[PDB]
Point group: C3
Chain length 183, copies 3
């Protein structure tokens, strides 16, 4: 079982500001010691669905958190819903919730939890995606590994933008990255 | 499919037609890593309209498009910009001795990236990258890759190259870019 | 044998300006005829540790070279130490030094040695990483394949920056790329 994913449909699966306000599409493919990751976001309703920074000058970022336990199982305080995250079966998920996915977790030696030791930047990957596929509508996607509390592992996606957008729907192009696997 | 590589071969022999016949070498390597295809791409334009860019004399020459069209079996169609002759599964630094029949597991996922319809068109079927002409850090061009948006095909991968700098007699040959996409199977 | 790496610890393994002044974290994972590569750099000491271009306007770039022989073994004139460059075992290396790694080497037809033939740019990958994980502290990472001499293969990482940084520590976010393997 080599791919954990959200199913690539458009059905809301994620809660940023209000219940099921978004569809996160995330595909994690195990290539041995690295996980190959592909992500995009469609916000379907609520506060982040249409950005207007004339109306709301300070609405410039938000975060989606995936929190995992010692067995790599998604925790319910995650923004992504548990029902929607599983190993691939065809164009869907297997019908039964998985019990172990440690091989897909971000490596804790590469990406340690917060402590009193010096924090290094290598637990971050920066990328840029484009709202509505327009090259003049960039938004930064910052991905951080294992920096959340209340979990053994975490992947967080912070979305932010510096431009003053006026009535721009928040739905994105796709971005690929990788990270070092725990096992 | 499992873990194979579909590619253009890594030589520099023109295999592609943008403005005139065989004016370019598209180097494209698609490697299957389960439910994702790891893609690596670069371009050398060797002749014709897009070979030497001068936006002082020709300010409107700012973009061009290379289309790969596929049938239900993932076989490349003759009318793509990329020639069929050397697009095949890898064997050594060349290709297998049979033109391939089946590569559906190298195709862009149709649920992820639907064909045009009157349903809402979402941006996730696009990946943006930036490559550099001549390997110079001050000569960016944008490579926009779009999945399954062409007609007359079951699947498609389309590369649009564009630039906003005013280049003066700059040869369009590029650094390499890597992306991935969700596989059909 | 699918992963050649530096280990994910933070122990210095690399000499930029002085002995073991840095940790290059480099993970090469063989996904058939493409190598999936993940890299970051922490500078701990020396000339490139704390960048101050008010004080030292000329300090704008440096290079880290990995040079390989015909069997894909790291030559000791590389900036990276041979001591911990090996195939993966857990969060560590295999017990004995590897003797063949040609399947991890950059392809010589794709990325030829310098010659009289026209030099093409496809043997370069550009990326941007962020010092200290700050989005306003970019530095460019330029990776070049097989352009060094006195070797069968090479991978070189050039780091440079255009901003006038005042007391900014050179430690980076992570970047992923790929390249065509020799076999
Ligand atoms: C890959 O797409 C981009 O790099 N978009 C940048 C964009 C683009 O270069 C320009 O608008 C020409 O169409 O310039 C930008 O300054 C912009 O905001 O438009 C930054 C984008 O990331
Ligand atoms: C990865 O390489 C780049 O980001 N190159 C940018 C380049 C570079 O920072 C500068 O010329 C100093 O060398 O700045 C640019 O504004 C430029 O066109 O020079 C955009 C390039 O994408
Ligand atoms: C992925 O991060 C970036 O694209 N950082 C750019 C950064 C950023 O957009 C801005 O400072 C707001 O955070 O603007 C920059 O002009 C900068 O140097 O700050 C270039 C960075 O590559
Ligand atoms: Zn709406
Ligand atoms: Zn030329
Ligand atoms: Zn330090």
């Amino acid at each position: 079982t080599r791919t954990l994913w959200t199913t690539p449909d458009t059905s809301p699966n994620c809660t940023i500001a209000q219940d099921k306000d978004s569809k996160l599409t995330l595909v994690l493919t195990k290539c041995g010691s690295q996980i190959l990751a592909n992500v995009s976001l469609i916000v379907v309703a609520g506060k982040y669905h249409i950005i207007n920074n004339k109306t709301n000058p300070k609405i410039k970022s938000f975060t989606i958190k995936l929190l995992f336990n010692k067995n790599g199982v998604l925790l319910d305080n995650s923004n992504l819903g548990k029902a929607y995250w599983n190993f691939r079966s065809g164009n869907s998920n297997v019908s039964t919730a998985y019990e172990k996915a440690i091989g897909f977790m971000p490596n804790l030696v590469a990406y340690p939890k917060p402590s009193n030791s010096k924090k290094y930047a290598r637990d971050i990957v920066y990328g840029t995606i484009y709202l509505g596929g327009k090259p003049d509508q960039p938004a930064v996607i910052k991905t951080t590994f294992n920096q959340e509390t209340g979990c053994e592992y975490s992947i967080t996606f912070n979305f932010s933008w510096s431009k003053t957008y006026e009535n721009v729907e928040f739905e994105t192009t796709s971005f690929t990255f990788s990270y070092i696997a725990q096992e």
